[PDB]
Amino acid sequence: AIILPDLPYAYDALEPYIDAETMTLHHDKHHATYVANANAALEKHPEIGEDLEALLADVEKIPADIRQALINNGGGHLNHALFWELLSPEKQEPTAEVAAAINEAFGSFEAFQEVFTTSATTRFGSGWAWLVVNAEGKLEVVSTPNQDTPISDGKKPILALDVWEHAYYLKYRNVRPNYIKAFFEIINWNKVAELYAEALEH
Amino acid sequence: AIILPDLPYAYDALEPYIDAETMTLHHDKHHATYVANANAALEKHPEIGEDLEALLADVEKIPADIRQALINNGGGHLNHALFWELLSPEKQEPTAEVAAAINEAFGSFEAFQEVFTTSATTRFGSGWAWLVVNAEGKLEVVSTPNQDTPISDGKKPILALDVWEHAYYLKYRNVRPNYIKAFFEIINWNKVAELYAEALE
Ligand SMILES: [Fe+3]
Ligand SMILES: [Fe+3]
Numbered sequence: 001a002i003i004l005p006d007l008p009y010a011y012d013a014l015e016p017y018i019d020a021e022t023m024t025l026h027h028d029k030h031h032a033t034y035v036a037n038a039n040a041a042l043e044k045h046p047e048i049g050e051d052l053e054a055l056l057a058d059v060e061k062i063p064a065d066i067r068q069a070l071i072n073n074g075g076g077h078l079n080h081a082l083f084w085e086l087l088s089p090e091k092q093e094p095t096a097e098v099a100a101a102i103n104e105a106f107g108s109f110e111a112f113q114e115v116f117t118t119s120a121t122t123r124f125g126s127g128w129a130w131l132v133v134n135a136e137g138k139l140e141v142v143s144t145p146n147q148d149t150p151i152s153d154g155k156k157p158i159l160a161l162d163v164w165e166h167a168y169y170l171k172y173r174n175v176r177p178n179y180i181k182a183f184f185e186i187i188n189w190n191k192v193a194e195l196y197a198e199a200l201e202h
Numbered sequence: 203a204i205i206l207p208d209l210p211y212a213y214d215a216l217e218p219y220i221d222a223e224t225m226t227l228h229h230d231k232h233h234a235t236y237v238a239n240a241n242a243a244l245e246k247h248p249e250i251g252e253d254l255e256a257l258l259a260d261v262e263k264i265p266a267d268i269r270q271a272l273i274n275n276g277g278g279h280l281n282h283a284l285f286w287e288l289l290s291p292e293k294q295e296p297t298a299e300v301a302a303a304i305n306e307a308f309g310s311f312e313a314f315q316e317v318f319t320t321s322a323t324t325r326f327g328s329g330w331a332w333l334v335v336n337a338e339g340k341l342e343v344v345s346t347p348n349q350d351t352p353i354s355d356g357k358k359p360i361l362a363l364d365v366w367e368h369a370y371y372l373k374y375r376n377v378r379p380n381y382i383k384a385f386f387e388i389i390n391w392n393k394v395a396e397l398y399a400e401a402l403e
Contacts, residue, residue, distance in 0.1 A: 125328035146327040165367035
């Protein structure tokens with residue numbers, strides 16, 4: 001069964017940039033729901049196993065009677081599990097490997113930050129902004145709706161920002177640009193590096 | 203230009219069911235932004251006029267360059283303008299013909315409320331739950347994503363509930379069902395009636 005992972009840090013470890021109340025609800029209610037619902041789907045189809053990264057890579061291969069349920073809830077699990085690991089109680093900067101990759105794709109960190117900020121800001125309705133490795137090993141910024149993940153498009157996420165209103169409304173209310181700015185103070189660049197390196201390996 | 207309508211009641215008129223801070227943000231920030239973005243789009247195309255209901259009923263006739271922006275922001279304005287009118291600061295009950303139509307269509311009001319509540323809770327992500335009069339003059343519950351409106355599908359709304367998290371999160375947090383229950387205390391049934399009568403015309 002899919003298990004709800006604990007946060008890597010205290011509920012208040014990302015203050016003042018994300019409030020503890022939001023960390024609490026976000027993890028203990030939202031993410032827990034996704035996990036429950038993902039487990040309900042998977043239990044109908046024990047034959048498919050519980051490797052959600054692999055299952056979500058080709059959604060058409062998921063059995064039709066649980067396909068949207070698994071996309072939405074298995075995707076909600078994957079995305080939030082990743083999100084928590086990508087947040088750091090301590091300030092960081094991109095490691096050399098990642099900074100070089102960013103410059104290769106976007107020219108400069110400032111350009112990347114503009115592009116990713118824009119992606120996060122213009123996502124209409126619920127969704128996520130991502131930095132991903134494509135099948136050629138090169139970086140892209142993309143956003144997705146609801147709990148859709150770029151894994152389903154053959155991409156490997158290295159950075160993820162939740163832009164559902166639940167992720168920011170208690171502190172930031174309508175002002176999602178302030179939330180997006182705040183995120184850049186709490187990125188776990190070392191975790192981005194790990195995911196980047198893993199994406200190149202095979 | 204599209205004008206932001208004032209609320210029909212004070213910001214705190216729906217308390218304790220909807221908090222004032224939400225009403226204020228929702229109207230003054232969210233709906234205002236939809237209006238501003240809708241005007242920015244229409245200003246590129248003055249020759250199309252500003253009849254958003256007509257424009258959104260057949261979106262394939264809004265120019266392509268502003269089509270999505272007008273769906274999202276034109277639709278955000280129409281949906282929110284309707285929603286403020288559908289809320290009542292004192293307790294109302296269904297009018298007779300609307301009650302009867304609901305019992306014919308749904309069995310009982312309690313079943314209708316269940317159906318509507320299911321639609322509202324299962325709308326995944328952002329969107330709206332609706333009671334509409336379809337092309338046959340028949341009642342249907344449906345949900346839509348984002349700011350999509352059933353008028354784009356030839357359906358006439360008589361009840362609408364915003365289930366974007368901005369509409370409920372400050373008070374209800376994750377518990378969208380408690381917000382939906384609260385809505386049922388604050389429906390303007392008189393408005394529902396007007397809308398229903400117009401749909402059947
Ligand atoms: Fe979330
Ligand atoms: Fe709204």
